[PDB]
Design a protein around this ligand. Structure first.
Ligand SMILES: CCCCCCCC/C=C/CCCCCCCC(=O)O
Ligand SMILES: CCCCCCCCCCCCCCCC(=O)O
Ligand SMILES: *[C@H]1O[C@H](CO)[C@@H](O)[C@H](O)[C@@H]1O
Ligand SMILES: [Cl-]
Ligand SMILES: [Cl-]
Ligand SMILES: [Mg+2]
Length: 466
């Protein structure tokens, strides 16, 4: 199984998850600083990213990891509140700029290509206090942030993710309220946030296109969380239609307006409007794009960035009562096949990635695809000699090979989440996705390879597997 010559082998981190230095050198607070510091068991053992892997302090140790692996690309994110403490260029933290420039320069001198995420679940607290993604104000705040990043780093960065997993962000932060700012708005906040996320992304793409592309000649997209979905009963038509609809809801809701025609999927619009009307809303809970917004949003992605971890079965679940929520709008329930292995919510279903990639090819006109996050967590106690997890990677790589070779999917980059064990959001440090083990009890936060790191390096060296 030899991959395409020039295939990109990457690993990924995100700023809140690895950096620490949460208030170092004039950095502003982000919503996770606020959220974690508030405690009340919303995170595992009330843990925080105050220090995390210490990558703000220990970038040189990250670079060693990256060099050992022989990555061709490295994905990391910029901390908006580190660069722009109040979210705006009124005040710019040069030490923030200098830190990210050092990563970018050190990458390039080592022949590693940066893939840079502007925003990864970590709003400046000031902008969240201004309504965050529930207010229209965010669009311009984000656009000006994106322009500042393009202007500052774009001379050396040619691959950008504007927003990490906008679909997960809108649900977790604003619908379920499991992420900051932590207020449930079931069936309303997710769609309201999604509307602004989609628009902020599109505006930032146009800013790149009209101001930076000619000179910098890079490409810009946003990443999306994707769970592959199969009908619970393969013979049930309602389940087949349900699995389709669940994909359309969670994935195409964002990808269709950006990649296809500037508007939401029709079944999304119809299910929500219909539900919304029976619930007594004077408006659909799904905000409409205006004709001008549809025109601005359409075609604002230079490649398809996807995250994949797992698959679910889907069963139709009629919303008889007119209950409020996204699942009830989609009229579905989801569950694993009881035969699947899991660690936390990651049920091991490597063929799901193949099906997802072929779906992306078929639905989004055979785009360039980057897998910007994929991997496997271990629980505590996590063995350094993680031979079972590595087996899961190997099965995943065989499926990527299948997608490329059999299905002719234009997958060009694969990025392992993560370079490092890190702060897994509400799981805190209890969930270890790293290729490198980090000891969070030791103040030096030493990095030590798992077996998966040594094995991944060999895949990279050989550009494929046997
Ligand atoms: C621990 C929970 C498992 C999390 C991963 C599985 C997610 C599968 C979601 C796909 C269903 C698509 C329908 C959109 C539902 C909105 C999401 C939600 O409110 O839960
Ligand atoms: C508002 C549009 C709907 C989009 C739905 C897609 C996002 C579904 C994710 C919700 C549950 C997943 C929780 C795991 C996320 C995480 O911990 O990183
Ligand atoms: C990228 O996104 C995945 C899925 O949400 C996380 O598990 C990970 O920690 C990273 O932030
Ligand atoms: Cl970020
Ligand atoms: Cl996922
Ligand atoms: Mg991603």
């Amino acid at each position: 199984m030899a991959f395409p010559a020039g295939f990109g082998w990457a690993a990924a981190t995100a700023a809140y998850q690895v950096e620490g230095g949460w208030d170092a050198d004039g950095k502003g607070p982000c919503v996770w600083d606020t959220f974690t510091h508030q405690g009340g068991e919303r995170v595992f053992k009330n843990q925080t990213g105050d220090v995390a892997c210490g990558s703000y302090t220990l970038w040189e140790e990250d670079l060693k990891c990256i060099k050992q692996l022989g990555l061709t690309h490295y994905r990391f994110s910029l901390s908006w509140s580190r660069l722009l403490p109040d979210g705006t260029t009124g005040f710019i933290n040069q030490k923030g700029i200098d830190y990210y420039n050092k990563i970018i320069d050190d990458l390039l001198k080592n022949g590693v290509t940066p893939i840079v995420t502007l925003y990864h679940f970590d709003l400046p607290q000031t902008l969240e206090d201004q309504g965050g993604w529930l207010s229209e104000a965010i669009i311009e705040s984000f656009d000006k942030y994106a322009q500042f990043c393009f202007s500052t780093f774009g001379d050396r960065v040619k691959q950008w993710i504007t927003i990490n997993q906008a679909n997960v962000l809108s649900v977790m932060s604003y619908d379920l309220g499991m992420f900051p700012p932590g207020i449930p708005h079931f069936g309303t906040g997710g769609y309201q946030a999604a509307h602004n996320l989609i628009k902020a992304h599109a505006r930032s793409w146009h800013s790149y296109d009209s101001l930076f592309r000619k000179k910098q000649k890079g490409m810009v997209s946003l990443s999306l969380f994707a769970v592959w979905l199969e009908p619970a009963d393969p013979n049930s038509v309602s389940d087949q239609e349900a699995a389709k609809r669940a994909i359309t809801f969670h994935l195409d809701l964002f990808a269709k307006p950006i990649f296809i025609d500037g508007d939401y999927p029709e079944v999304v619009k119809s299910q929500i409007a219909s539900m919304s009307q029976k619930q007594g809303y004077p408006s659909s809970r799904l905000p409409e794009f205006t004709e001008e917004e549809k025109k601005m949003i359409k075609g604002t992605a230079d490649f398809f960035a996807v995250q994949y971890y797992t698959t679910r079965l889907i069963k139709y679940q009629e919303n008889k009562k007119g209950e409020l929520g996204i699942l009830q709008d989609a009229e579905i329930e989801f569950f694993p096949d009881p035969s699947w292995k899991n660690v936390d919510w990651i049920y091991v279903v490597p063929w799901g990635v193949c099906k997802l990639l072929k779906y992306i090819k078929d639905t989004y006109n055979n785009p360039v695809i980057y897998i910007t996050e994929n991997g496997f967590p271990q629980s505590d106690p996590a063995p350094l000699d993680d031979t079972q997890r590595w087996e899961y990677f190997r099965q995943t790589f065989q499926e990527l090979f299948k997608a490329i070779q059999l299905d002719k999917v234009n997958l060009q980059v694969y990025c392992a989440w993560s370079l490092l064990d890190n702060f897994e959001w509400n799981q805190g440090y209890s969930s270890r996705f790293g290729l490198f083990h980090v000891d969070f009890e030791d103040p030096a936060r030493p990095r030590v390879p798992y077996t998966s790191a040594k094995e991944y390096a060999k895949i990279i060296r050989n550009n494929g597997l046997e």
